[PDB]
Design goal:
Chains A, B: It catalyses: a hydroperoxide + [thioredoxin]-dithiol = an alcohol + [thioredoxin]-disulfide + H2O. Chains A, B: Homodimer; disulfide-linked, upon oxidation. 5 homodimers assemble to form a ring-like decamer. Interacts with GDPD5; forms a mixed-disulfide with GDPD5. Interacts with SESN1 and SESN2. Interacts with FAM107A. Chains A, B: It holds the Pfam family AhpC-TSA. The structure is a homodimer. The first copy, chain A, has about 170 residues and is of the alpha/beta class. Chain A has one domain: Glutaredoxin (3-Layer(aba) Sandwich). In chain A, about 25% of the residues lie in helices and about 25% in strands. In chain A, strands 2-1-5-4-3-6-7 form a 7-stranded mixed beta sheet. In chain A, strand 6 and strand 7 form a beta hairpin. The longest helix of chain A has 16 residues. The radius of gyration of chain A is 15 Å and the shape is globular. The interface between A and B is medium-sized, with 36 and 34 residues. Strand 7 of chain A pairs antiparallel with strand 7 of chain B, so a sheet runs across the interface. Bound molecules: chloride ion (2 copies).
């Protein structure tokens, strides 16, 4: 995807995120070296058809934390639009309070490095990337379905990647 | 990935496949226009660690059939290696009988159009692509894990994509 290749360092980024406590903080993917990262890039905070897909991850953020994994959301929304949408109830198409950081990519540079930028317009597809503790991209999954991701499936994947890390000649049976 | 892009026609291919009945037949992705296709590209038929991932799809081929979906496997194995491995019991690292066609890509051209070729060596990663009845690429999922794919998850995804088609403005809930 653009510059994202399985088994190679996940493209780096340094951008401003709206943290769960409300603060704007400029974070880098490298800050999470030492732990797993489930980086989920979605089109926009505002949704009309289904709830923004990132919400289900916020809701289950603790299960990811339990697995030494940090979930980070991202969309081409500016940090103000992010905040604005977090302060808009889910029933009005918004996000509601968030338990994970939301990265802002209004310049679309991150969407590009991850190859999830749409061809005609400036918004992304739904891209999920599982990155390991060493910063290596391990899973790439893209689609334009407002229900593509399954939080249980992703949790199972992280477990498989960790198991593999801790064994490797043995089938994650 | 290579040329594969969500929402765009899935890269075309015409290659020889070992059919379920045992015959070699040159098949094209367009032949399946009208139905869904789950295209699963795996590295090699021969496995040491876990069973080759394509086996789970062969075993459950009828469930995809029920959903107007054809599963097609593919690897850089030649049509002779494919037949040889189909005729090697799963317990010897082989595949055992197959209910779905297995595409051969010894020239690695398909691996390339689908962006699943490794950088250093000539074998692929594990690439799953869900293509719709119109030949449009709908899901791209790559990883190098011998357990990355979940047959239940994929079946769910196909049902979701079909539902989107038949409705859209409504959430698959
Ligand atoms: Cl979404
Ligand atoms: Cl495999």
């Amino acid at each position: 995807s653009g510059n994202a290749k399985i088994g190679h360092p996940a493209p780096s980024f340094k951008a401003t995120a709206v943290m769960p406590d409300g603060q704007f903080k400029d974070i880098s993917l490298s800050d999470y070296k030492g732990k797993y990262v489930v980086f989920f890039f979605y089109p926009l905070d505002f949704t009309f058809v289904c709830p923004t897909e990132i919400i289900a991850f916020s809701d289950r953020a603790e299960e990811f934390k339990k697995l030494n994994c940090q979930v980070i959301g991202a969309s081409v929304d500016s940090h103000f639009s992010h905040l604005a949408w977090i302060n808009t109830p889910k029933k009005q198409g918004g996000l509601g309070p968030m338990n994970i950081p939301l990265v802002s990519d209004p310049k679309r540079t991150i969407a590009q490095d991850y190859g999830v930028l749409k061809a005609d317009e400036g918004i992304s597809f739904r891209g999920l990337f599982i990155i390991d503790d060493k910063g290596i991209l391990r899973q790439i999954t893209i689609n334009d379905l407002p229900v593509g991701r399954s939080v249980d499936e992703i949790l199972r994947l992280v477990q498989a990647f960790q198991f593999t890390d801790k064994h490797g000649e043995v089938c994650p049976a």
